[PDB]
């Protein structure tokens, strides 16, 4: 079930996954409509879900992954898409084989350096590039 802001856009949470305390690496995954495409893992809030929460299942559900939830980092508007997202960090601490969607969609993953996170983001998702910016 969608849920929605008083405005009307569309309530999501993710988190920025990264391999340790350092947050040099971040798990990012592939584009379910495209998928030779990166996208940082995230998706719709449930009703009456905690955004931590549902940061921490999507992240579960897309990426495969479990970690310490660290800070929200902040609340990022795409104007074009109409939603809104909460984005924490998470410090992964587990990383399980055959995920949600890796077994439903054949979703991939993969590590990237910061800086090459961000590129790969830039073109298709230039908000989620801005998730990094802070
Ligand atoms: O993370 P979500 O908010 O679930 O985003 C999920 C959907 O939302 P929904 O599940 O249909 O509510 C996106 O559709 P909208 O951009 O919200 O129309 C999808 O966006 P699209 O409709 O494809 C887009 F935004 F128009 P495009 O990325 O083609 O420019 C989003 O696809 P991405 O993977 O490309 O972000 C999908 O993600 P996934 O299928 O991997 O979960
Ligand atoms: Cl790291
Ligand atoms: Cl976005
Ligand atoms: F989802
Ligand atoms: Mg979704
Ligand atoms: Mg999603
Ligand atoms: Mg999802
Ligand atoms: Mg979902």
């Keep these: 079930t969608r849920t929605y802001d008083g405005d009307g856009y569309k309530k999501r949470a993710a988190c920025l996954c990264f391999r340790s ?25 449930e009703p009456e879900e905690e955004p931590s ?23 990022f508007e795409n104007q074009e898409r109409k939603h809104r997202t909460y984005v924490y960090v998470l410090i992964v601490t587990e990383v399980l084989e055959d995920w949600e969607d890796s077994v439903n969609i054949g979703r991939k993953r993969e590590w990237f350096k910061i800086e090459d996170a961000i590129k790969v983001l830039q073109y298709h998702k230039p908000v989620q590039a801005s998730y990094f910016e802070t």
Excluded: F, Q
């Excluded at 305390?21 to 809030?45: A, K, N, Q, T, Y």
């Excluded at 929460?53 to 495969?64: F, I, L, Q, S, T």
């Design 21 to 45: 305390e350092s947050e040099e690496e971040v798990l990012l995954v592939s584009s379910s409509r495209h998928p030779d495409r990166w996208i940082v893992p995230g998706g719709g809030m």
């Design 53 to 75: 929460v549902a940061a921490v299942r999507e992240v579960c559900e897309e990426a495969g992954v479990k970690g310490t939830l660290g800070r929200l980092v902040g609340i």
